């Protein structure tokens, strides 16, 4: 290493990866919700019919 | 009452047979109560 | 990683690392929230389809007549402000009021036609004028489709 | 304790878009509501918290009682952060709550946040406060809007409020500058506390 | 009475096309119709089925009862089917416009 104190920025490179791992579960889960709905819509036509 | 004619096309050994009503339907009925098979054969004309 | 690393003792200073490492909690714990949210709506998502198919799972079993459809016509679909129909009617104002969407005109083996509103999981692509349905016999909607029609005796070529 | 209900009372102001807790006020406050959720749940699980809102410019119940925090934090999602909190109206809408339950086992909490300038009446407030002993009900009032530039009015209704009871009203101080409001809030005491019998 | 019917189709168990909800008939069958299900994964389909035609001429479609094979299931086969809801209960012997043979058998 360069620095001894960069023991503690592979702690924080650590929490950089959850953080941008968090960024994309919560457009993943949206992406999955926006597919249960036209499954949600596909059945509630067919309750009005 | 009403003792409904139908025609017995064919009986089968089991107490039943088959047959088909003048007014369309066919049914698969028994052969049940106050009844001799040797009195039945093709082309009767029974009380259902 | 872009930041916080070996790249970034040359770039940056380590204490506004430190100090960035804080940030980085504090922006995780918003997003903790935000995830815990979009769970929780899923759970009351999933239990309202299975609501709504188990209904639709009575009427798919046993027994059900088989017909023949005499023509798709359609009306315009339901969107509209004044009406929602191909056929011009009487008064103002309708989109549900006797307005109606998407017209099958399907013609039984017991010997009549029905103009009932199609059901909306069945396309007009599984739809053509002369297609083999399922009609629900205790209330008429196309209920399936089915193969076209052979006789024992082309069954029995084969 | 364990065995109680509580009522939160959120503050909607324009006090609270104000940069006093990372990232923002607001976003400190959902933090909070959840941290206060969970640690009446973990002790005993008959424990249940719903949230009102001063959201609108009349309070609206976004949820009632429930065990489920999924419900506490989408309806908390929903939101008007131009609305305005009235304390007096607020007061008698949570009692109201209270009365709305389905086991009548619980204790009777309200635990209200206060994130403006109280801008009501003193003469009607001390009217309310002592409505609430007559009720068994005590109130757990969390102050970081009013010590921040306006007078102590909240201190003696308090005391009014303060009598031999089952759970008995508590006065929770906290800092307005930034030290962040979810661990604060958490230190205080929000489960053990007692009552004055 | 047991409303005697004719099979006219022998539906199999893999690719029925009873759900049609994740299947295709008009450009499918595939093996399966319940087993590509999304909606939230369920197998909601019995294993075949069978298109009667009735002597009254109204066709339906039909199962297998309690007790009754779908082994002994053959084309043009009579089959009885209960005068109410249409089930399978006792398979019968094939054809009926035969009966002036029964006088020739000597």
Do not use: W
């Not at chain 3, 103009?115 to 909306?120: E, H, I, S």
């Not at chain 4, 119940?61 to 939101?79: P, Q, Y």
């Not at chain 4, 809408?93 to 206060?114: E, P």
């Not at chain 4, 009871?165 to 604060?184: A, F, I």
């Amino acid at each position: 290493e360069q620095e001894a104190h960069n023991k503690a920025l592979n702690q924080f490179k650590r929490k950089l990866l959850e953080h941008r791992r968090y960024d994309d579960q919560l457009k993943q889960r949206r992406q999955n919700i926006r597919d249960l709905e036209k499954l949600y819509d596909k059945t509630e036509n067919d309750i009005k019919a | 009452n009403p003792l409904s004619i139908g025609t017995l096309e064919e009986i089968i050994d089991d107490d039943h047979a088959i047959v088909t009503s003048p007014t369309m339907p066919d049914y698969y009925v028994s052969i049940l109560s106050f009844v001799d098979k040797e009195l039945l054969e093709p082309g009767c004309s029974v009380l259902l | 990683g872009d930041d916080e690393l070996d790249q970034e003792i040359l770039n940056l200073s380590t204490q506004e690392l430190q100090t960035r490492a804080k940030l980085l909690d504090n922006e995780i714990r918003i997003f903790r929230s935000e995830l815990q949210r979009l769970s929780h709506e899923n759970n009351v998502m999933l239990e309202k389809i299975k609501d709504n198919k188990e209904k639709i799972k009575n009427n798919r079993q046993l027994p059900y007549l088989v017909a023949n459809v005499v023509e798709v016509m359609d009306m315009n679909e339901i969107e509209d402000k004044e009406n929602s129909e191909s056929t011009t009617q009487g008064g103002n104002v309708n989109l549900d009021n006797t307005a109606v969407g998407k017209a099958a005109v399907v013609k039984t083996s017991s010997r009549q036609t029905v103009f009932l509103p199609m059901v909306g999981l069945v396309d007009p692509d599984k739809l053509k004028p002369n297609d083999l349905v399922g009609v629900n016999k205790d209330s008429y909607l196309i209920l399936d489709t089915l193969p076209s029609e052979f006789d024992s005796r082309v069954k029995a070529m084969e | 304790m364990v065995l109680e209900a509580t009522v939160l009372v959120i503050d909607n102001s324009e006090y609270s878009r104000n940069g006093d807790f990372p990232r923002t006020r607001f976003e400190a406050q959902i933090d909070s509501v959840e941290f206060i959720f969970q640690a009446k749940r973990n002790s005993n699980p008959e424990n249940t918290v719903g949230l009102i809102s001063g959201a609108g410019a009349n309070p609206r119940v976004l949820s009632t009682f429930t065990a489920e925090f999924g419900k506490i934090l989408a309806g908390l999602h929903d939101t008007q952060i131009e609305g305005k909190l009235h304390m007096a109206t607020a007061l008698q809408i949570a009692q109201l709550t209270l009365k709305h339950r389905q086991n009548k086992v619980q204790h009777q909490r309200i635990v209200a946040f206060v994130c403006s300038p109280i801008s009501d009446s003193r003469d009607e407030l001390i009217r309310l406060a002592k409505t609430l002993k007559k009720n068994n009900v005590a109130v757990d009032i969390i102050n970081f809007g009013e010590i921040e530039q306006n007078t102590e009015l909240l201190d003696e209704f308090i005391a009014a409020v303060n009598n031999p009871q089952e759970e008995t009203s508590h006065l929770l101080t906290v800092t307005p500058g930034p030290r962040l409001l979810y661990e604060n809030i958490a230190s205080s005491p929000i489960i053990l506390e007692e009552g004055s019998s | 009475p047991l409303q005697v019917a004719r099979c006219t189709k022998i539906i199999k168990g893999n690719g029925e096309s009873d759900e049609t909800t994740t299947d295709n008939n008009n450009s499918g069958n595939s093996n399966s119709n319940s087993n590509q299900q999304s909606t939230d994964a369920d197998e909601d389909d019995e294993d075949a089925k069978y298109v009667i035609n009735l002597k009254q001429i109204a066709k339906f479609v039909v199962g297998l009862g309690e007790r009754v094979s779908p082994t002994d299931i053959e084309e043009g086969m009579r089959v009885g089917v209960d005068r109410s809801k249409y089930n399978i209960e006792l398979p019968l012997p094939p054809r009926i416009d035969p009966s002036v043979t029964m006088m020739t058998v000597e």
